[PDB]
Amino acid sequence: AAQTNAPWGLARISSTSPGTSTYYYDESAGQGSCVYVIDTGIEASHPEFEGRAQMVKTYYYSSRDGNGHGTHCAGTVGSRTYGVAKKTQLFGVKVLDDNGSGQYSTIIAGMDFVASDKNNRNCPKGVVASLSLGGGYSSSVNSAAARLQSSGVMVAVAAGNNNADARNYSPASEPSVCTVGASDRYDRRSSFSNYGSVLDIFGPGTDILSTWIGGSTRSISGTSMATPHVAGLAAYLMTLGKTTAASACRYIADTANKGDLSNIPFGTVNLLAYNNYQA
């Protein structure tokens, strides 16, 4: 399948070169997979989600996304126009309040929630969790991400936006999950992207168009935007049967575009997520 005039990041993930604008992908499109977006919520009524999104859990007075961040991330995972995996099922877990903040204890509870809740959902092709959040190093936060991964969920986490070594941030620094840095449309490391040996992969993160609350759209930047590209890619590849939740991060790194990004610090992987789809 070909989506013309796609957001640059979608085009990038199906291309061996920057500077194109069509996204190419197998029509299975993540059908039969599920992606949990652990964030500020998801505006599931957005036409872009086509009934495939739902809120399953909140720790606050509403499950609605009063911020937009979670809706944007969910759109990059799986919206019809802005999403990598256009037929996946999206499940929202609201661990962040409408200001975008959340206590680590709530975030940990949300991760353990997903590890159990997947047993209440139909995801024959596999389960992914996208975590566009983080703060300073916490062994308990890292351990929660490790448990979620161990339970059979492909965990993708943002590296962070500090232009610093991600070893000092959580859950970015957890070795067993997929830690995602951000790149721009010219294949440069995004100016804010964290780096370091703990990163597994880069995805598009600068000037990413996606869904927003109020049935709208907007372009924003962050490792929060790169992470759902990788989460959606994992769901897409699991639906194709090419990899599993336990092996998808390594498979994405195996099959990435290699050595094409600029301003990658010595010791950080130079790997850009790529679907290897041959139309």
Swiss-Prot record:
Sites where the protein binds Ca(2+) 1: 175, 177, 200
Q: How is the cofactor bound?
A: Binds 2 calcium ions per subunit.
Q: Which residues of the full protein are shown?
A: 106 to 384 of 384
- Tell me which Gene Ontology terms the entry assigns under biological process: proteolysis
Q: Name one GO cellular component term.
A: extracellular region
Can you say what this protein is called? Proteinase K
Positions binding Ca(2+) 2 in this chain are 16, 260
Q: Where is the Peptidase S8 domain?
A: 7-279
Catalytic class of the enzyme:
hydrolase
Its job: Hydrolyzes keratin at aromatic and hydrophobic residues.
The cofactor named in the record is:
Ca(2+)
Q: Name one GO molecular function term.
A: serine-type endopeptidase activity
- What species is given as this protein's source? Parengyodontium album (Tritirachium album)
Name the gene for this chain. Answer: PROK
Tell me the protein family, please: Belongs to the peptidase S8 family.
Intrachain S-S bonds:
34-123, 178-249
Q: Which UniProt keywords apply?
A: Calcium, Disulfide bond, Hydrolase, Metal-binding, Protease, Serine protease, Signal, Zymogen
